[PDB]
Design a protein around this nucleic acid. Structure first.
Ligand code: ANP
Ligand code: ANP
Ligand code: ANP
Ligand code: MG
Ligand code: MG
Ligand code: MG
Lengths: 314, 315, 308
DNA sequence: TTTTTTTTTTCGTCGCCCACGCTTT
DNA sequence: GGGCGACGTAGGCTGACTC
DNA sequence: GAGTCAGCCTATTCTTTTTT
């Protein structure tokens, strides 16, 4: 919420920060969250330019030791976008939370993109009846973004039309390097607007196909880590929920389970860098089962939703 | 689709274009959908050259953020090919869609190569009766391409008969590889003439046999993923409909099932997420099959019914 | 039908061409119909030795796109061996075509080997009478190959005798492994003389007996999906007319299902179904076929093979 | 003239089988 | 009705025999 | 009395469920 126009001051001109702009940084909270090395590789930045930039960015960002009675009253006003369902909102104690990565893995025909389609329409509702009012972002990397399914949920939620269809930025990631450069552009839109969501559908779809052979595994999880850290600097900067959708693999070995293995794709890189992880599952007919699979404050309980003609629901 | 020669400017000499055309990059929308680490693995191309290519290609291909209103206006002009059956059409809301991979699994004699023979005569129809006004590629992998069915679906409708059999490219895949190489030779054929179909008679047929499992399960699924990736590049670059046919493996146990040989598609979880829509051809009575939408991001899970008939899939 | 000796060129020494003959590959076609990954596993070929094999092979045998009107004038030269009948020759549109597998399941006594004893005599008739032109090759596996039935089918079409019995190669399977190494010695005699049929009777017979239990249902169906693949190779190069004989199990759900499962049901163009009727008259219903409608007919096993 | 640091990372499902058993004036 | 077992368990070396 | 020829740990022990 602070563009770099309040940092082009105090012994710093705007020409040097003009380099920061094309370096990726568009916020005062984006250079302060960045280390010395990352901003020292930029052509132009002298070590002094670097230490001055950091010390003057520290001025406008709280970087210190707060108490836990001041962090409790900052998360008592956190916005929680509601999913379409009520049995899925009770399980999550309020819908997807803002300022945290929320993975949704599952296998197929489970509802990983129908939740991401009823979330891009509820995150446009007043906070008093749903999500936090603001636009959304759909970074679709599978080809499945149906705008005809947004007008179905925005016929039950009372939202009208092309208004819903308009406050949804949509981008299509074609490879694994254009996925990560589609965020240096998203951080340019989120500061000249008010977004309240960032859906990255199948965030790990273009990793299964780009890096393959076990000789490209340390080079894949060193890119996934960068991705999920760049996606964690968008959730702390502007406070936007970051639902990321994942996939599953099948460990073909000793059962040691007695049973069908799912074990979502992405190792201990997308597992240790994710706040909540919902495990969607197939059920009888149109009913699905969503089990919380990891969360710092939520019980490991189960729920029940259904993919209606209006997105997920009851 | 603009050829690679279209980007030949800005200090990109013709040798670069030529050495990019030998790696399977024949379109300017095939070098902008390619990661840099894959343009680096090409002889001659260095880091600076790769960056130059990837910068001068993103100026010729739209790569950015667009609202969901200029995507709901480029999606209302999606030509949907008729499948030959009204019931099948209603279930699929109009017919196979352009720009997507549409899988069709099911046990033997269900109809998966007859909805692949009535589909390649319908894509050559005018758009007023359902079609694409183009040609129909047919990369068959099992040897069951019979052009005497394209000469009956061409009499049910009204086409000539000698002009429907001329607008059908045919190629037989003989290995797990080669099958992909046909998709690399397919970019050449599709840049020049207008194609509107990419039928693959059995994608996961040569994967079995060529791979023995467990030992090569991992290897087979990184070769299948690199096949369903070309199938998506060709679809999102040429705007064609990549129909595709799958086989079936019976869950011998563990599935903990009960009914008759519950059957699941082969291919694992890498043909399950890659495919946009999945249709399940089942069999009923004498000449009456069943079709249930397994997976689809827009279509409700329904259940239609069709008949192989003598003039191709109908009702 | 090009001996692999033709590949002996461009850095292809007799060391390499020899190396190919003891792995199975005997025709240059069989090498272009072969994955890259399979070449390295053969000893002596490491990285670019294998690649160079395929590069010159791909120029000899053509593998690429072609119009579907120059495939019609390839499907109009199919030999279509007659199965010594007329009611079974109108059900099929001219008997067993060449270049495609054809399973014939049924039950005991139906006549799956009495049609394999008529397609070993009517595959040597002149192409005018309705047969092919060459030599049958019976690969029997159950032990039922009585050569007094392919001599009483020869005293019906005017064929002399011993000569009809001189063009029918024979081999017993013995094991599930011996019957797939018999397809590698068949590719050695198809490249010299002209063969027009591979009866391979009693397939999937030593699979229900050698590989037994749900424990082997995996290695049975990747040793049967490879047998049915080597069988599709000899049907593509030499244009032979591979016939296959299945058996059945009894569905105990609540009922004659052929053995093999979804492995033998998928890798098959046409698929007949013999069934016993009254007296010596059976029923042949086309289970599966990619072009031919699904109907049924009536044949009869009289004293000279399949008759009417 | 010299004087050795420093680990990283998971990925991939497959293959159907086997018939039984008379009983009722 | 009731049935399960399958890498990529390598490699260096203890059991064990083999001369 | 070392040569092949071998059969297994250097490390343990989670999933977690559908499908008719
Ligand atoms: N000309 C025809 N007239 C009527 N029915 C036909 C005709 N040709 C084929 N059929 C029927 O269509 C059925 C389906 O054949 P096909 O479409 O090849 O099945 P499939 O599922 O593709 N088989 P496979 O590829 O071996 O798994 C056949 O089994 C026949 O019953
Ligand atoms: N309009 C609709 N009405 C009812 N049900 C629908 C509708 N659209 C989709 N569905 C159902 O919801 C599912 C949507 O697909 P979804 O489960 O979101 O894809 P996914 O799990 O991401 N699969 P993939 O991306 O291929 O791994 C379908 O399989 C249908 O069962
Ligand atoms: N010379 C003959 N004259 C008349 N009928 C004959 C003659 N030879 C055989 N048959 C009949 O043909 C039947 C079928 O034999 P065959 O073709 O071996 O059956 P099958 O079902 O293939 N046997 P199997 O392989 O054990 O399942 C015999 O059982 C006899 O009834
Ligand atoms: Mg979706
Ligand atoms: Mg077929
Ligand atoms: Mg027999």
């Amino acid at each position: 919420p602070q563009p770099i126009s309040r940092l082009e001051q105090c012994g710093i001109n705007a020409n040097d920060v003009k380099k920061l702009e094309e370096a990726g940084y568009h916020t005062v909270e984006a250079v302060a969250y960045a280390p010395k090395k990352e901003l020292i590789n930029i052509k132009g930045i002298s070590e002094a330019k670097a230490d001055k930039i950091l010390t003057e960015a520290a001025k406008l960002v709280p970087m210190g030791f707060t108490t836990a009675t001041e962090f409790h009253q900052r998360r008592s006003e956190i916005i929680q976008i509601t999913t379409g369902s009520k049995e899925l909102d009770k399980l999550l104690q309020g819908g997807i939370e803002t300022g945290s990565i929320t993975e949704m893995f599952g296998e197929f025909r489970t509802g990983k993109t129908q939740i991401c389609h009823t979330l891009a329409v509820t995150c446009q509702l007043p906070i008093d009846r749903g999500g936090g009012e603001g636009k959304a972002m759909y970074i679709d990397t599978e080809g499945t973004f149906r705008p005809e399914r947004l007008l179905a949920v925005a016929e039950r939620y009372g939202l009208s039309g092309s208004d819903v269809l308009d406050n949804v930025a949509y981008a299509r990631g074609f490879n694994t390097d254009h996925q990560t450069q589609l965020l240096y552009q998203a951080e340019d839109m989120m500061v000249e607007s008010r977004y309240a969501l960032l859906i990255v559908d199948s965030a790990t779809a273009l990793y299964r196909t780009d890096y393959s052979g076990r000789g490209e595994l340390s080079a894949r999880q060193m890119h996934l880590a960068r991705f999920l850290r760049m996606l964690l600097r968008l959730a702390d900067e502007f406070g936007v929920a970051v639902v990321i959708t994942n996939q599953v693999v099948a460990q073909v070995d000793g059962a040691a389970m007695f049973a069908d293995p799912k074990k979502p794709i992405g190792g201990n890189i997308i597992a240790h860098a994710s706040t909540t992880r919902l495990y969607l599952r197939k059920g009888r007919g149109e009913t699905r089962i969503c089990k919380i699979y990891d969360s710092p404050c939520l019980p490991e309980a189960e729920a029940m939703f259904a993919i209606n003609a209006d997105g997920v629901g009851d």
